[PDB]
Amino acid sequence: PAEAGITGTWSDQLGDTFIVTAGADGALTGTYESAVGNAESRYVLTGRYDSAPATDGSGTALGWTVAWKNNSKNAHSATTWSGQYVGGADAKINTQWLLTSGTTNANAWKSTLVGHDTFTKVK
Amino acid sequence: GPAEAGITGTWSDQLGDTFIVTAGADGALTGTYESAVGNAESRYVLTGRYDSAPATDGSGTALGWTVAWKNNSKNAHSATTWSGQYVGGADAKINTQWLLTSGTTNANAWKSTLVGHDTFTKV
Amino acid sequence: GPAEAGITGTWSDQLGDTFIVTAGADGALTGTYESAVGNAESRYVLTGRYDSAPATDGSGTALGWTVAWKNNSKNAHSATTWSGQYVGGADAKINTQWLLTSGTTNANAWKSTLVGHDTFTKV
Amino acid sequence: PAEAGITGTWSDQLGDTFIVTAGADGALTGTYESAVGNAESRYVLTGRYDSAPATDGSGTALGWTVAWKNNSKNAHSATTWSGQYVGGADAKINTQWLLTSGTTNANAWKSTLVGHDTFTKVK
Ligand SMILES: N=C1N[C@H]2[C@H](CS[C@H]2CCCCC(=O)NCCCCCC(=O)O)N1
Numbered sequence: 001p002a003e004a005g006i007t008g009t010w011s012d013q014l015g016d017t018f019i020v021t022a023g024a025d026g027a028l029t030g031t032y033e034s035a036v037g038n039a040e041s042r043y044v045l046t047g048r049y050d051s052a053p054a055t056d057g058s059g060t061a062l063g064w065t066v067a068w069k070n071n072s073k074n075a076h077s078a079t080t081w082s083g084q085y086v087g088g089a090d091a092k093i094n095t096q097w098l099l100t101s102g103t104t105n106a107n108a109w110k111s112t113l114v115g116h117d118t119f120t121k122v123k
Numbered sequence: 124g125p126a127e128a129g130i131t132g133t134w135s136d137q138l139g140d141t142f143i144v145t146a147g148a149d150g151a152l153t154g155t156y157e158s159a160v161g162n163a164e165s166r167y168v169l170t171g172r173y174d175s176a177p178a179t180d181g182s183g184t185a186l187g188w189t190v191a192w193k194n195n196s197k198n199a200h201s202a203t204t205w206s207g208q209y210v211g212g213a214d215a216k217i218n219t220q221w222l223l224t225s226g227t228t229n230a231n232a233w234k235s236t237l238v239g240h241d242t243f244t245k246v
Numbered sequence: 247g248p249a250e251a252g253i254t255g256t257w258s259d260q261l262g263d264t265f266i267v268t269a270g271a272d273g274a275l276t277g278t279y280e281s282a283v284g285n286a287e288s289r290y291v292l293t294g295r296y297d298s299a300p301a302t303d304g305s306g307t308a309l310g311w312t313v314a315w316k317n318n319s320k321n322a323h324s325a326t327t328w329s330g331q332y333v334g335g336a337d338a339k340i341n342t343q344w345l346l347t348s349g350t351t352n353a354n355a356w357k358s359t360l361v362g363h364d365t366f367t368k369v
Numbered sequence: 370p371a372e373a374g375i376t377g378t379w380s381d382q383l384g385d386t387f388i389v390t391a392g393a394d395g396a397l398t399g400t401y402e403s404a405v406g407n408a409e410s411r412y413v414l415t416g417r418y419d420s421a422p423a424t425d426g427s428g429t430a431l432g433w434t435v436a437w438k439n440n441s442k443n444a445h446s447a448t449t450w451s452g453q454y455v456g457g458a459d460a461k462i463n464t465q466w467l468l469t470s471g472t473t474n475a476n477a478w479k480s481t482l483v484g485h486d487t488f489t490k491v492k
């Protein structure tokens with residue numbers, strides 16, 4: 001059920017569009033379109049989920065990555081989201097993320113932002 | 124190009140993990156991860172993304188990947204994402220931070236996500 | 247000034263914690279924290295710092311604080327830091343992210359640190 | 370042992386100067402002088418540590434905060450370090466940190482940097 005549950009189009013508090021397909025044994029593939037930052041149009045994403053989650057009430061662990069390069073822009077950075085899908089009537093994907101920019105070693109202390117996103121399904 | 128040649132290969136870290144990765148197809152990472160520690164045995168699939176046209180000013184090459192800790196023999200109901208950068212030169216490294224989320228009930232979500240850092244060196 | 251008046255008070259969060267803090271002396275935070283979850287009972291000492299001359303452009307007021315989880319009742323061999331910002335207005339909040347580090351052996355340091363987020367609202 | 374262990378002058382891989390005093394029941398007080406960022410001269414720090422750590426080889430949990438305002442500069446930000454002191458012939462304080470800048474709510478996604486610092490004692 002997690003495969004059909006995860007598969008679809010999602011948004012979050014920032015108003016992004018996250019389109020993903022969950023494959024039968026753990027793949028995530030899709031596109032991300034960002035409301036903020038140095039971004040336009042869609043970016044490829046790929047990731048993995050637990051395709052046989054626990055049946056005790058726990059969420060389904062998952063993660064995915066976007067590198068912020070597409071055919072028209074390159075922000076020299078990549079974001080990974082790590083979180084869990086919680087199904088039901090008001091399904092959500094609750095995540096934390098790490099956004100690393102390419103930097104010189106001297107500037108590596110300011111390479112990585114951290115935050116959180118909650119996604120809700122729109123389709 | 125040099126980002127693909129630099130990232131592709133077999134990498135280890137201080138914990139003695141084995142990270143086998145190919146970078147190609149204009150931004151895809153694919154490969155397997157074997158964890159020396161934790162609730163893990165043998166290889167797990169990884170997928171991720173990298174910047175396939177990084178800056179040439181001395182900055183590293185941003186990248187990220189995910190492992191869901193389920194394979195054919197074991198399932199730890201969790202996923203790790205690494206977000207970081209590849210830095211070439213005489214001691215080439217992939218410098219990362221990571222988020223490890225376990226599937227939890229809502230009551231236990233506050234304790235769902237570990238954070239840390241890994242530096243990989245090429246074998 | 248308004249940062250002191252805004253931050254000083256009693257606050258709670260989504261878990262039902264009680265955070266009692268005074269902001270004064272040009273940047274000090276002092277008070278007590280009572281945790282609704284985890285290996286914790288009764289009040290713990292907190293100390294921290296805040297920006298006592300924040301910008302006036304609409305941005306929040308940066309702050310952070312620490313609790314070591316030892317008091318006269320219990321010791322959980324761990325400490326949490328919250329780093330975030332106070333945002334005034336109708337619906338004033340302190341928006342934070344946190345790192346909870348437990349004492350571990352070196353070998354187990356990869357499991358030492360949980361990460362998450364808390365939003366505090368004034369009671 | 371943790372009090373004498375922690376108290377002193379420390380540096381890290383960036384070349385900072387961290388001067389701290391650990392009090393018998395858990396206080397940390399001192400100053401921080403930064404090699405990087407929008408910073409000059411000393412800043413106040415305060416934090417907390419576990420004053421009765423485990424004796425099984427585990428580290429001593431601690432954390433502290435700096436708000437980046439002193440008599441001559443204000444970077445409208447605060448960093449919290451969360452980590453553990455490990456004693457012996459190679460004593461270190463191993464940390465992760467969160468650096469939050471005051472932002473508008475629209476820019477909160479880019480308010481918080483994450484990283485790690487390892488301190489070693491100079492005196
Ligand atoms: N849903 C989310 N949107 C934002 C966060 C994490 S991913 C981010 C959007 C990123 C778009 C691409 C981008 O602007 N990358 C460059 C970031 C440079 C940040 C420099 C900094 O201010 O420290 N969460």
Ligand SMILES: N=C1N[C@H]2[C@H](CS[C@H]2CCCCC(=O)NCCCCCC(=O)O)N1
Nearest residue numbers: 158161162163192199201203223241356357
């Ligand atoms: N190279 C690394 N090895 C470890 C860190 C992040 S990935 C991790 C190995 C994870 C193996 C799978 C596994 O044990 N997952 C379940 C973790 C449950 C942790 C619960 C807790 O201690 O909060 N970095």
Ligand SMILES: N=C1N[C@H]2[C@H](CS[C@H]2CCCCC(=O)NCCCCCC(=O)O)N1
Nearest residue numbers: 233234281283284285286315322324326346
């Ligand atoms: N408001 C919050 N409450 C919880 C989070 C971070 S602080 C935490 C409460 C911590 C209470 C003290 C405590 O239980 N310390 C030991 C933590 C052991 C977690 C071990 C693990 O599951 O990896 N946010």
Ligand SMILES: N=C1N[C@H]2[C@H](CS[C@H]2CCCCC(=O)NCCCCCC(=O)O)N1
Nearest residue numbers: 109110403405406407408437444446448468
């Ligand atoms: N030892 C360390 N030094 C750096 C890291 C975390 S604390 C940091 C030094 C911070 C100095 C004050 C300062 O520049 N604050 C403003 C930071 C704005 C970052 C904006 C961005 O690039 O996203 N660790």
